[PDB]
Design a protein around this ligand. Structure first.
Ligand SMILES: Nc1nc2c(ncn2[C@@H]2O[C@H](COP(=O)(O)OP(=O)(O)OP(=O)(O)O)[C@@H](O)[C@H]2O)c(=O)[nH]1
Ligand SMILES: Nc1nc2c(ncn2[C@@H]2O[C@H](COP(=O)(O)OP(=O)(O)O)[C@@H](O)[C@H]2O)c(=O)[nH]1
Ligand SMILES: Nc1nc2c(ncn2[C@@H]2O[C@H](COP(=O)(O)OP(=O)(O)O)[C@@H](O)[C@H]2O)c(=O)[nH]1
Ligand SMILES: [Mg+2]
Lengths: 437, 431, 49, 139, 51, 54, 68, 26, 49, 107, 431
């Protein structure tokens, strides 16, 4: 009955999808060939996998995912990888040319090449689903397929499916870490397109997760695998209550209601605790109050945006493990009595608590230690107006000289979309300052 | 043969009512497969208050499970005492309102009320007396508040004179567990005031305080909270379900509770309650039962009764006792605490005594009280509502699902009038 | 499941691959007659008479 | 009744843990078999010094045979533990038999059985590295 | 007690067919042999009360 | 009165047993569906390899 | 001469491998056994209450005085 | 957690040996 | 060994399987309740009908 | 091209519980009643004869393809609350322009 | 000893009647070879109603089998219980109507009705009492509708006083099953109004929801669909075959329902209906049996008697039960749902009671309703007919088979007049 269709667009989205589907296969006991390990006795005759893996009449558990990227490799790496038998051949869609860090290529010329095919696959998966909780779109604002085609797919999904829940996982561009030059252009255009065609877009960024891996896990070479493993743990703690028994159950259609106060303010943060290594987990108690304080500590954030400079508007706490609601209430009340954490005056009831009995899952060969309790904290501070200001300053800095505009012009968009995108983001910044005051 | 039709809606409803059914089944001697392994015939004499007779010794509960989303209903039908319910009494949707009163009341929740009323009509006309309906809902949620109050309104229109008892898990002073719970609580209590004739306000912080202080319990879990709530559900029905020296059914309780039609919010209580290693210090007697009832610690609401005035109060005792002892205890409480009771009503205590105690306990007692301290709960909800409503926050999620600001304004004014009524009856003098 | 009953019937055709239908009725020259009686049932299964 | 049911639940849990251990070792040395086949095919392509290649390849083929012996043993143990985990009170296969609460003669510790499988895998890895060094010597 | 008594017993001899090295005295047989002794012990308590 | 109740209870018990037998046969038919699907998968893996196409 | 360990070995194939670990048992089953057995409430526990399941109508024509 | 840290240290040592071998076959 | 009275319920701290089997579901367009066969964690049900 | 309802059986036969989560196609349920006999208004070819009213819509229906859809979609907001007055005017203007674009593509 | 002759026309009629002879041979103990192996003598005690006796112990059915192709009758003969039928009763042609009413009524069915009439005349003069005729067909096919209505017309010309029953598998509102169903149904209803004594309009979709919701059953299959239809026929006919406390044959049924001659279109219903695994929770009482009758979801037609108004209701309780429970439940359901009942007919329910329940059942109950809600079916058919006939859809087949358009106009006018009288008797008041 619970159904989440997971669309991974972009190279970042596809790699994060690899990590998250490895995590779900491990959590539901599905081997990489897509079958139960030659037994139907683990969990009995269970169908708790139905939230992620469609099941045929023979034991093959095909997932409910669509992996889309215009460029070859990466998706073809999934095709020729260890999880080759698990994924359906039409579930992995690949074009000929690459979007090449171009929002115009992703949105007008090359993105519209594959959008009918991707929508057809999404339609078949939705018709196979017995009642959708929503879509989970994994992408990055860096540019190209994860920006232009992601915005186009969201726009067409808003056309077709109406008021269906769309939960987004965006690798937001880091404040100083960057791997491209047109990241502000692509981010401004994608945000302007997807202000109205979105519900709740969780943000992560590579710089803050690098700092997390350096400080907590003590990894001096964090590659994208570790980053995607923490993102997989975040999305698994998000979706755990649809598939595991919990004291307080939260589903996918409550994250918009409990975290979007106003229709343009739909860009929440993300935090996971306790992100810890084995030698530090041997020392630390990792109690409920400790991890609850660690979530609101302004060093465990994964968005690289100090929330002391902003005011909390909403929070969604997702506890999992052998956590008790009595200590949950005690810790979340001590946070409210604490003065470092500051809330808006118009939201006294600013928390949504969801408790799940299932302990966190330890991947083999991973970096996180084995913990009995965990919190996935989902804040909605107005501190992100700082990041919007820095991004808008970069956009104006490259836009006054009209640099890199001729690529977008030659690939199918004029100056009007640039101008109205910057106007919309300035209006968004004024909205953030107004909702802050 | 006063039947009672049970209704559990929402996640909290489907948990609390399931615990209620598995604590009623042990009192009436019903095993998990549904047969009657009873000790005395007193368990079988009044089993039709909650059960319908089936083939053999099978007794099926008269409960309706309503939810817009499977989940905890699957959990309670896969746990113990979950296969006794009839599979047709499991009306479920597919989306879920999910902390949205508008989505639970004026959307896809409204295209389940036909099936729910079909099930309720079946279980209602499969009766002969039909004392009342009771609901176990969860003010602060989507399918507990909205859909539950919609069912309350429709069934109140169908059956006006029968009892419409509700058990509302109200929002907490500290900790929210839902961002939009002031909106949900106000929009649900607006329906509750005009529709229901008696409503028991259970608060999760009060349950936590009882389990942490009277019971210690280290790690309580929601099972013990639901057990406390369920014990007080059974405490107001034990007079119907077993013979006593002084019987008082739900209608007698309502008549001796509410002085005015808009004062039907009580604070329940169950007070044989000891710690783990505290049996050696309390040899249970009627006087310490009464002082544990009237103690502010063992009140299942955040409303301190010392910050108010007891309009009326009822006490349903179970077990073996002396009526002289019971009446002298309540008179002694009233005479010592004169200012905590309204002076224009003499003997605010309505006593009922049933001979049959709960199993294990020698004798028990259930406390319910209509006091003017519930204005603190309604005033806190009004304060949070007017904090969230001035800036129009989290309100497009309601007006896009299809309502208007006039309903919010009317609900706020209704609850303010409720606060004003409680305040004017708190400080009213005799002459 | 022993009594017949509304809906209390299962599938004997389960797992069968052949569903061949024989022509029991035909016109010989101009008259209609049961040309079967030596032809099997569905899928080559033998009849009773 | 409660004690007998709860002991049955503990027995089923321990059987499930044993089944998971069998499945892990099964998959591990099956993967070792696959790498042995792939390395053998590469050594055949490199052969197409010759006597040394023949001896090393024969050692590889024998190590693959020993791994397959172990795989058959673990597959048989897995199919046994399947039905032993699946049996319960309601199942019809449950049957009278004579006194079977015995500890047999010459049995293995779990650590000794895991050590035997680990030594098989280590010997296969040594043969694989020797064949890789032989391929590098040919090239 | 008749059902769980033979659930143990049928499980033992079916686990005696482990071919060469899988005949293991793992920490499952230890509890499983004790189950045979315990269920027979608990039968004797019931039969003593029955007499 | 005892004979009336005995006849009603005997009829009811016959109902329960017939419904339980029918439900068990339905579960066996479902397992047969799974077995036929597995046999079809084996037939596709055996007789329908891509090299076998003419 | 290509380097042996980091020569041709892709990141996903070296990191997103098939899961294989001897500690998969602890993932879904605790090695610590549960330290109790709990039966249902019994007749010696529901009948330890003095004069249990009897009412005030039973003292009529009973011959015993009322000390209850 | 002790076993996890021990096998992570062993993997780190094997990493160091492999990278040293790559550096010296450069 | 204990009566069912408020704080006399003990939960197992060892189990970590949990999950949730999907019994109540939809097929075609109708509500099929379906018989549950798996508890919370694959443990057998206390009642088997 | 019609459903004409099913009275009791509206629990099923809606697209959302028939596993079709897209936008439903709305038909005319609760069928009407006539008094008897009809005008023939057509020849033996299916053509509409001279005089009958004819729809101004396209005879091939309306299906705006991917490459003739407008490059801007409004957003499906249907709330118009907590927005500024220029914001509401902008949403109404773009709704009207995109509806005009779909009508242009259809006819 | 009152004999009725059974006719099957078309694919639907052939399969439904084959299942009907299967179930009424099972309840009479007739083995597939044709002999008798029943337990009690009551099974063969009134065997003359449905079976003619051959030499020895052979009991052939009193059935006529009509279809323009060997086809479905070939499958029936090469199916179970297919050897009991006489081979001389299989009347068939060569061409086969291509779902064409004009072909089945004017071209292909014209030169076969003589052979069918000779078979029917012989098999009816073999009777001794000849109560009447019953025909199974659909109003959506070629030889089911056209040939069936031609048979009805010729048989009413032959025997004008005998009772006529039709079982009339009507087109469904949802799905299609044939694209020329409005033409076939409009042309067949125009014959059924002026030539049938009673008509049970049966809907595939309503039977689908009955078989899939109230019986679960997953894959329903036409075996179970036709068996539900056959169970309704057996419950209708049973007072001829088994004794009872208050018996009622076909003429009693037709007299006590049909108020005015062109209002004989009924909705059948069989109401023991237990889902798989809910018999344990089932109570098996007369009030529950009557409640499962008088539920709108249990009708075998798409029309809603809650939308319409009941004219006459016939309930046949086939089994052993009490006149107390039966009569008081009919009175209670009438007095509660007096809105869905015509006031100018006081106590508009006929009650019949048999004594032999189905094998494997304690009690059964067949429901027949003559509500004014059945005008919705004819409104659906007439509106689809207008939508096709305005643009002359598929009309060249009917005109090329030698048949004019004034036949279509007269059929539509008769159906619209039928809807007019149904609405008139719905909204007419008492005084
Ligand atoms: N967390 C995480 N981020 C990634 C990963 N891969 C890429 N990114 C981020 O994605 C941003 C660039 O977007 P890409 O996904 O590479 O671009 P694309 O979606 O493939 O579209 P094209 O550039 O046209 O090919 C970079 O700034 C990275 O921060 C990954 O594996 N994990
Ligand atoms: N006493 C009690 N309260 C509960 C239980 N489950 C949830 N709640 C409370 O219900 C509130 C959440 O409401 P929710 O169940 O999500 O409402 P719904 O979405 O309409 O079902 C929280 O504040 C919890 O404190 C329970 O089992 N017992
Ligand atoms: N209930 C039921 N309906 C049937 C069966 N076979 C056909 N039908 C219905 O009959 C209609 C088609 O009529 P058809 O049998 O083709 O008539 P014919 O062409 O004159 O033989 C369809 O609407 C079907 O729903 C059956 O076995 N059972
Ligand atoms: Mg790329």
């Amino acid at each position: 009955m619970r159904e989440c269709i997971s669309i991974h667009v972009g190279q970042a989205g596809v790699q994060i999808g690899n990590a998250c589907w490895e995590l779900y296969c491990l959590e539901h006991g599905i081997q990489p060939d897509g079958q139960m390990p030659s037994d139907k006795t683990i969990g009995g005759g269970d169908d708790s996998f139905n939230t992620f893996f469609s099941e045929t009449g023979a034991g093959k558990h095909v997932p409910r995912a669509v992996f889309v990227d215009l460029e070859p490799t990466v998706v073809d790496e999934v095709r020729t990888g260890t999880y080759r038998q698990l994924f359906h051949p039409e579930q992995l869609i690949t074009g000929k040319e690459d979007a090449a860090n171009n929002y115009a290529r992703g949105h007008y010329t090359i993105g519209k090449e594959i959008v009918d095919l991707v929508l057809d696959r999404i339609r078949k998966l939705a018709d196979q689903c017995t009642g959708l909780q929503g879509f989970l779109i994994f992408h990055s604002f860096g540019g190209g397929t994860g920006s232009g085609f992601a915005s186009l797919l969201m726009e067409r999904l808003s056309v077709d499916y109406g008021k269906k829940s769309k939960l987004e996982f965006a690798i937001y561009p880091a404040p100083q870490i960057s791997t491209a030059v047109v990241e502000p252009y692509n981010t401004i255009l994608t945000t302007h397109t997807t202000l109205e065609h979105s519900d709740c877009a969780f943000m992560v960024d590579n710089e803050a997760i690098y700092d997390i891996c350096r400080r907590n896990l003590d990894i001096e070479r964090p590659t994208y695998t570790n980053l995607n493993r923490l993102i997989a743990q975040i999305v698994s703690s998000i979706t755990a209550s649809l598939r595991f028994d919990g004291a307080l159950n939260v589903d996918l259609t409550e994250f918009q209601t409990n975290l979007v106060p106003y229709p343009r303010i739909h860009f929440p943060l993300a935090t996971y605790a306790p992100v810890i290594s084995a030698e530090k987990a041997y020392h630390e108690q990792l109690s409920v109050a400790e991890i609850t304080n660690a979530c609101f500590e302004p060093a465990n954030q994964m968005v690289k945006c100090d929330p002391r400079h902003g005011k909390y508007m909403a929070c969604c706490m997702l506890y999992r493990g052998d956590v008790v609601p009595k200590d949950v209430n005690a810790a979340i009340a001590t946070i409210k009595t604490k003065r470092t954490i500051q809330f808006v005056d118009w939201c006294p009831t600013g928390f949504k608590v969801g408790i799940n009995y299932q302990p966190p899952t330890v991947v083999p060969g991973g970096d996180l230690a084995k913990v009995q309790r965990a919190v996935c904290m989902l804040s909605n501070t107005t501190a992100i107006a700082e990041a919007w200001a820095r991004l808008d300053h970069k956009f104006d800095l490259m836009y006054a000289k009209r640099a890199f505009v001729h690529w977008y012009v030659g690939e199918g968009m004029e100056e009007g979309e640039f101008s109205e995108a910057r106007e919309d983001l300035a209006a968004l910044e004024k909205d953030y300052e107004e909702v802050g005051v | 043969m006063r039947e009672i039709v049970h209704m559990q809606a929402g996640q909290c409803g489907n948990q609390i009512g399931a615990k209620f059914w598995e604590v009623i089944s042990d009192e009436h001697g019903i095993d998990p497969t549904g047969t009657y392994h009873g000790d005395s015939d007193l368990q079988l004499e009044r089993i039709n208050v909650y059960y319908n007779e089936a083939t053999g010794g099978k007794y099926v509960p008269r409960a309706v499970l309503v939810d817009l989303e499977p989940g905890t209903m699957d959990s309670v039908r896969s746990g113990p005492f979950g296969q006794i319910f009839r599979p047709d009494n499991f009306v479920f949707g597919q989306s879920g309102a999910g902390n949205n009163w508008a989505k639970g009341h004026y959307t896809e929740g409204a295209e389940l009320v036909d099936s729910v009323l079909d099930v309720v009509r079946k279980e209602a006309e499969s009766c002969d007396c039909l004392q009342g309906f009771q609901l176990t809902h969860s003010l602060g949620g989507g399918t507990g508040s909205g859909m539950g109050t919609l069912l309350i309104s429709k069934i109140r229109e169908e059956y006006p004179d029968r009892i419409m008892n509700t058990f509302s898990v109200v929002p907490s002073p500290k900790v929210s567990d839902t961002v939009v719970e002031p909106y949900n609580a106000t929009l649900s209590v607006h329906q509750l005031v005009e529709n229901t004739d008696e409503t028991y306000c259970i608060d999760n912080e009060a349950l936590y305080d009882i389990c942490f202080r009277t019971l210690k319990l280290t790690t309580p879990t929601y099972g013990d909270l639901n057990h406390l709530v369920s014990a007080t559900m059974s405490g107001v029905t034990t007079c119907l379900r077993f013979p006593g020296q002084l019987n008082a059914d739900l209608r007698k309780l309502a008549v001796n509770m509410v002085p005015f039609p808009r004062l039907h919010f009580f604070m329940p209580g169950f007070a044989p309650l000891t710690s783990r290693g505290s049996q050696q210090y309390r040899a249970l007697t009627v006087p310490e039962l009464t002082q544990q009832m009237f103690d502010a610690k063992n009140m299942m609401a955040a409303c301190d009764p010392r910050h108010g005035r007891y309009l009326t109060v009822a006490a349903i005792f179970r077990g073996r006792m002396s009526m002289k002892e019971v009446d002298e205890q309540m008179l002694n409480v009233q005479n010592k605490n004169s200012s905590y009771f309204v002076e224009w009503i003499p003997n605010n205590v309505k006593t009922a005594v049933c001979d049959i105690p709960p199993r294990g306990l020698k004798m028990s007692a259930t406390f319910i009280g209509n006091s003017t301290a519930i204005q603190e709960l309604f005033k806190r909800i009004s304060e949070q509502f007017t904090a969230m409503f001035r800036r129009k926050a989290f309100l497009h999620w309601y007006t896009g699902e299809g309502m208007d600001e006039m309903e919010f304004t009317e609900a706020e004014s209704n609850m303010n009038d409720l606060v004003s009524e409680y305040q004017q009856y708190q400080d009213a003098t005799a002459e | 499941s022993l009594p017949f009953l509304p809906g209390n019937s299962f599938n004997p055709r389960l797992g069968r691959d052949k569903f061949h239908k024989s022509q029991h009725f035909d016109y010989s020259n101009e008259v209609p007659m049961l040309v079967g009686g030596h032809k099997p049932g569905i899928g080559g299964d033998k009849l009773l008479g | 009744h409660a004690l007998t049911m709860r002991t049955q639940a503990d027995v089923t849990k321990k059987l499930g843990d044993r089944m998971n251990d069998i499945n892990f070792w099964k998959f591990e040395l099956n993967r070792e078999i696959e790498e042995m086949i792939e390395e053998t095919d590469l050594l055949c392509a490199q052969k197409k010094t010759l006597e040394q290649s023949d001896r090393q390849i024969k050692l590889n083929r024998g190590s693959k045979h020993k791994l397959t012996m172990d795989w058959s043993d673990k597959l048989s143990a897995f199919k046994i533990d399947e039905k032993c985990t699946g049996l319960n009170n309601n199942s019809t296969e449950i049957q009278y038999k004579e006194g079977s609460a015995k500890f047999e003669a010459v049995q293995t510790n779990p650590q000794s059985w895991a050590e035997f499988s680990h030594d098989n895998v280590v010997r296969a890895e040594h043969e694989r590295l020797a064949s890789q060094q032989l391929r590098n010597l040919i090239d | 007690k008749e059902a769980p008594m033979k659930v143990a017993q049928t499980r033992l001899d079916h686990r005696t067919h482990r071919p060469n090295v899988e005949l293991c005295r793992d920490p499952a047989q230890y509890r499983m042999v004790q189950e045979v002794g315990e269920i027979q012990d608990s039968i004797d308590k019931l039969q003593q009360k029955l007499a | 009165e005892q004979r009336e109740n005995d006849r009603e209870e005997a009829f009811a018990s016959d109902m329960i047993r017939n419904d339980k037998i029918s439900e068990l046969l339905q579960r066996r038919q479902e397992q047969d569906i799974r077995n036929l699907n597995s046999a079809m998968n084996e037939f596709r893996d055996l007789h329908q390899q891509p090299e076998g196409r003419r | 001469k290509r380097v042996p360990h980091a020569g041709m070995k892709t990141t996903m194939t070296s990191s997103y491998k098939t899961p294989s670990d001897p500690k998969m048992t602890e993932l879904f089953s605790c090695p610590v056994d549960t330290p109790w057995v709990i039966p249902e409430a019994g007749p010696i526990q529901t009948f330890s209450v003095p004069n249990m399941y009897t009412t005030e109508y039973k003292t009529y024509a009973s011959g015993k005085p009322i000390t209850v | 957690n002790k076993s996890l840290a021990d096998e992570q240290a062993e993997k780190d040592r094997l990493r160091r040996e492999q990278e040293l071998d790559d550096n010296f076959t450069e | 060994a204990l009566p069912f009275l408020p704080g006399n319920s003990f939960t197992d701290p060892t189990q970590r399987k949990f999950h949730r089997s999907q019994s109540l579901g939809y097929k075609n367009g109708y509500a099929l309740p379906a018989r549950p066969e798996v508890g919370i964690g694959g443990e057998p049900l206390e009642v088997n009908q | 091209s019609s459903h004409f309802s099913a009275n009791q059986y509206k629990q099923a036969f809606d697209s959302r519980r028939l596993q079709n989560s897209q936008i439903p196609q709305t038909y005319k349920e609760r069928p009407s009643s006539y008094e008897g006999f009809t005008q023939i208004i057509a020849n033996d070819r299916g053509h509409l004869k001279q005089g009958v009213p004819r729809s101004k819509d396209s005879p091939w229906g309306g299906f705006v393809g991917t490459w003739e859809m407008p490059k801007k979609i409004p957003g499906n907001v249907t709330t118009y609350m907590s927005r500024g007055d220029p914001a509401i005017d902008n949403i109404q203007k773009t709704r009207a322009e995109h509806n005009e674009y779909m009508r242009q593509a259809v006819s």
